[PDB]
UniProtKB/TrEMBL annotation, chain A:
Cu(+) 2 binds at H217. Cu(+) 3 binds at H260. Ca(2+) 5 binds at E303. Ca(2+) 1 binds at E56. This is Ribonucleoside-diphosphate reductase, beta subunit. Transmembrane segments: none annotated. Keywords: Calcium, Metal-binding, Oxidoreductase. It comes from Aerococcus urinae (strain CCUG 59500 / ACS-120-V-Col10a). It is an enzyme of class 1 (oxidoreductase). Ca(2+) 2 binds at S132. Its EC number is 1.17.4.1. It comes from the Bacteria.
UniProtKB/TrEMBL annotation, chain B:
Ca(2+) 3 binds at G268, D271, E272. Ca(2+) 2 binds at S133. It comes from Aerococcus urinae (strain CCUG 59500 / ACS-120-V-Col10a). This is Ribonucleoside-diphosphate reductase, beta subunit. The keyword Calcium applies. Ca(2+) 1 binds at E57. Its EC number is 1.17.4.1. Keywords: Calcium, Metal-binding, Oxidoreductase. Cu(+) 3 binds at H261.
Length: 308, 313
């Protein structure tokens, strides 16, 4: 016989966030960082916290010479693109990441998504630091007006936010992965294109610090998606895969319209979209699915890939 | 004719994403503007809390092993229990409290500052794990978690605050958000400072001071935003909210006194810890813009303990 003198505290208690939103049948347990359910959580926690950075760390002032070499058209494109990325980071920091907390599989995940919310806030702030150093007050104001009135740009966050505010945690998680995994890469093409040609090298250092976080954010949300979806019936799993491909198809549609409008005048649209679709493929892979994208429609110039 | 607006500025015909998400989908969304800051206080607080970034790995807790090993099983148990209880409160604030504030922000930057608070209060909870990892046995750690779950006096306190976080009233939510860093953990913080005043667990007290360096600003900030918001109510509804703040604090003091008596009576620390608690209840009210109704005698702290609190870094 196995004598169980007492019942384990963990299995007869709930985390505070579960108690707040889902289940008040039992008392609350403090987070246990000494008895960790999933080692992956500790791995991710250690990496993202050790990778802490602020845009003040980077000497953007040194980009002044190369910035001054860029025509007014190019300076406007960069300010607009980056203000567009600032909107996506604002959406993700203030809504996306914090929405994931209550849907966590583990205690540590609740704290990791709090880190994500803060750090995606830092990404948004970093564009502010670049503009502060390089842009005129007029260029900054123009870009904000341009973002507010750009329907093609607005359609992308408008399509994802409903999944965050709705009560389907798997659809929320897919949206949460889609932001760092796909939606910003069309924008990140521009600084990598420029740095490959020797322009704005210090700005591209900030972009790489953002990417170092965003690749982990994509991996982590995709990993948690795969854990949860694996527990559903074959039929439910087939419905969720269909939803993922349907949502990505819509988002690719909306991104292609926005990038054409953004880049067609500069001759960068086709290149940016292939860069976008390459990352759409990696997004699908991080969700445990296969990329249906061709070699031809995902081709990236070596020097751009090198900046990546 | 003379005053007609032909160009409406972007800001006043757009909403932040969180406003769009939960309140109003009629207007397009504006990206955060860090180049035209509405409240300079937000930038000062942002710069301070980000510059004050720390991880518990930074403190050599293993240097506490000698002083820890001098404390008997009863004292080691009390410390593990007390800190697991503070871990619960930090978990509540990080996972519910701080993130609930984001959508009720007055400014764009405030939305990002509360994201920082959520994360750093997560770091506070994690730091107790680091202390336990170094000092405590598996048995002590698990014992403390069981004790927290089954301690009704402990549980009553967070159970009283969470409803304000999940409810609709953003002013009542903000009061709870100030009350957690301002008041509810200080009863527990007395213990490490009592010990380090006597040269016991000095490295643990450095972690407590790094936590407090954050908590003090969190209390100040939530208090500052509370004052800006209540100033926009009729004098009648101002008097009504003030009464609520005093009624809530009165209730929370009652629950805290019960918990601290149960926690400390056996160790003869209950009276001193409650005085320490009421001293910080005073600071909480002052940070909401009210006067402390507590006496010098009610809030007396031994100088050597106050030296540990007010010490820097
Ligand atoms: Cl992101
Ligand atoms: Cl994210
Ligand atoms: Cl707090
Ligand atoms: Cl807080
Ligand atoms: Cu992210
Ligand atoms: Cu706090």
């Amino acid at each position: 016989n196995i004598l169980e003198m007492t019942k384990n505290y963990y299995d007869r208690s709930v985390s505070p966030v579960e108690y707040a939103y889902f289940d008040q049948s039992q008392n609350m347990r403090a987070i246990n960082w000494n008895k960790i359910v999933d080692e992956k959580d500790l791995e991710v926690w250690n990496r993202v916290t050790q990778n802490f950075w602020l845009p003040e760390n980077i000497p953007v002032s040194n980009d002044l010479p190369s910035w001054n070499e860029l025509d007014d058209d190019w300076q406007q494109l960069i300010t607009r693109t980056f203000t567009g990325l600032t909107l996506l980071d604002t959406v993700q920091s203030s809504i996306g990441d914090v929405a994931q907390i209550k849907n966590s599989l583990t205690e540590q995940e609740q704290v990791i998504y709090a880190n994500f919310a803060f750090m995606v806030g830092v990404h948004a702030r970093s564009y502010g630091t670049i503009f502060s150093t390089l842009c005129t007050s007029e260029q900054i104001e123009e870009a904000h007006e341009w973002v507010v009135d750009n329907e093609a740009l607005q359609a992308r966050p408008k399509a994802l936010i409903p999944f965050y505010t709705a009560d389907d945690p798997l659809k929320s998680k897919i949206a949460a992965a889609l932001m760092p995994g796909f939606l910003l890469y069309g924008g990140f093409y521009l600084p990598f294109y420029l740095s490959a040609r020797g322009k704005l090298p210090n700005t591209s250092d900030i972009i790489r610090l953002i990417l170092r976080d965003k690749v982990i954010h994509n991996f982590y949300s995709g990993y948690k998606y795969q854990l949860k979806v694996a527990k559903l019936s074959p039929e439910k799993q087939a419905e969720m895969k269909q939803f993922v491909f349907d949502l990505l198809d819509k988002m690719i549609g909306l991104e292609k319209t926005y990038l054409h409008q953004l880049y067609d005048g500069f001759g960068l649209a086709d290149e940016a979209i292939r860069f976008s679709l390459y990352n759409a493929g990696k997004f699908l892979q991080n969700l445990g699915y296969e990329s249906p994208f061709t070699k031809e429609e995902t081709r990236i110039a070596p020097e751009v890939f090198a900046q990546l």
